[PDB]
């Protein structure tokens, strides 16, 4: 019942540097050890350094000797994570864990992208003859080179929503983000309705209805 | 650096079953270990520290124990909740470093997925690229390759996969595979194939298209 309560995302471009939080409560971060840890997109825990707040006392492992920078204050009781000289590498999620590893914060999401707010192109992708199997087609929509995320995808203004599977999106070298959004449906009803996928991208405020006919190849 | 093995990478159970994961410490670390738990949101807890002591409001379901240099954490009993990923953790020196990680995820019989092949839209071709995407839809267990072949040539480096989570009401998996060219690279070949090897197919399957005829 002490938490560890750490800042908000980031999207900071390549070549600058951020300084990250995690406030402590509960406690005194003077008499334990703060440390850092980092996890890269669908991979596992690295260890980054520690800091004594006592005394400022910091150790790091050597893979971050010139990346990271720990610091505390304990008039606020906080610890800082300072990441200089960004790249792809370095987007990741950043724990911060104190009082032997029993507590930890929620993580903080740093994203490294040059790209500047941008909304998405959408492009059908068309159910087939070909791939058609025991009356039922496959069909969706694919949302490309958008940033930041999130975006919002519905299917025939939110009244379709089983069988649909919209992917996480892969965050490509251009900066950008791209997802797929399919769904598979009774391929007899191609015959009567048209369907219609419906993207939202807030940050760059692009509402999109995108039609997604038969198209056999 | 300790290096810390931790295995199985992937767990696969039912409600009620019991369920063991192990490391194995490169060096003597006397017991100085933790086993920690990361739920689906990403929130990190610790269950067991010294090896075999479990912190204050761990259920009873979770033990470790050593046996020489191998550490294991056991849940009997599973539960819902228990659907996460577990990570051991050495404190006897620095730099500090974890296992691997192990997936702990629902038990279910072999599907085979249904796999859909896609040629990019003719409105993505003038814009300069083209994105041919190659669907495996809902399969069991999350192991599966996906090749991308070009006239026969295997590509390496110019797709991207994507998987999501098991499905809540039937367990499975869907993957998509992107594979992403100029329209000036795209037009040099013709057959674009997707092979798929899965456990529940008895041979790889290809799905495939001939640009050209699009």
């Known amino acids: 019942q002490v938490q560890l309560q750490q800042s908000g995302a980031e999207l900071v471009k390549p070549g600058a540097s951020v300084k990250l939080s995690c406030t402590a409560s509960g406690f005194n971060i003077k008499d334990t050890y703060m440390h850092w840890v980092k996890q890269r997109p669908e991979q596992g825990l690295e260890w980054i350094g520690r800091?004594?707040?006592?005394?400022?006392?910091?150790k790091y492992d050597p893979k971050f000797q010139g990346k990271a920078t720990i610091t505390a204050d304990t008039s606020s009781n906080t610890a800082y994570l300072q990441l200089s000289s960004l790249t792809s590498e370095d987007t990741a999620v950043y724990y911060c864990?104190?009082?032997?590893?029993?507590?930890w914060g929620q993580g903080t999401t740093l994203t490294v992208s040059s790209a500047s707010t941008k909304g998405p192109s959408v492009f059908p992708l068309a159910p087939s003859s070909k791939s058609t199997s025991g009356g039922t087609a496959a069909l969706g929509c694919l949302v490309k080179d958008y940033f930041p995320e999130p975006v919002t995808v519905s299917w025939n203004s939110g009244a379709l929503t089983s069988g649909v599977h919209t992917f996480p999106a892969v965050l490509q070298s251009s900066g950008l983000y791209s997802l797929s959004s399919v769904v598979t449906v009774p391929s007899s009803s191609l015959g009567t309705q048209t369907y219609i996928c419906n993207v939202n991208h807030k940050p760059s405020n692009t509402k999109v209805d995108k039609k997604v006919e038969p198209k056999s190849c | 650096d300790i290096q810390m093995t931790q295995s199985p990478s992937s767990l696969s159970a039912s409600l009620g079953e019991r369920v063991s994961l192990t490391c194995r410490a490169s060096q003597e670390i006397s017991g100085y270990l933790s086993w920690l738990q990361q739920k689906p949101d990403g929130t990190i807890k610790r269950l067991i520290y010294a090896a075999s002591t479990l912190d204050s409001g761990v259920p009873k379901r979770f033990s470790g124990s050593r046996s020489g240099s191998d550490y294991s954490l056991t849940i009997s009993s599973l539960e819902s909740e228990d659907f996460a990923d577990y990570y051991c953790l050495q404190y006897a020196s620095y730099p500090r470093t974890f296992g691997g990680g192990t997936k702990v995820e629902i038990k279910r019989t072999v599907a085979a997925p249904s796999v859909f092949i896609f040629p990019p839209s003719d409105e993505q071709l003038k814009s300069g690229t083209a994105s041919v995407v190659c669907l495996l839809n809902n399969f069991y267990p999350r192991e599966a390759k996906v090749q991308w072949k070009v006239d026969n040539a295997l590509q390496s480096g110019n797709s991207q996969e994507s998987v999501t989570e098991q499905d809540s009401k039937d367990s499975t998996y869907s993957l998509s595979s992107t594979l992403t060219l100029s329209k000036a690279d795209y037009e040099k070949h013709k057959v674009y194939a997707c092979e798929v090897t899965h456990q529940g197919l008895s041979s790889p399957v290809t799905k495939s298209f001939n640009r050209g005829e699009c």
């Open positions: 800091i004594d707040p006592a005394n400022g006392n910091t």
């Open positions: 864990a104190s009082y032997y590893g029993i507590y």
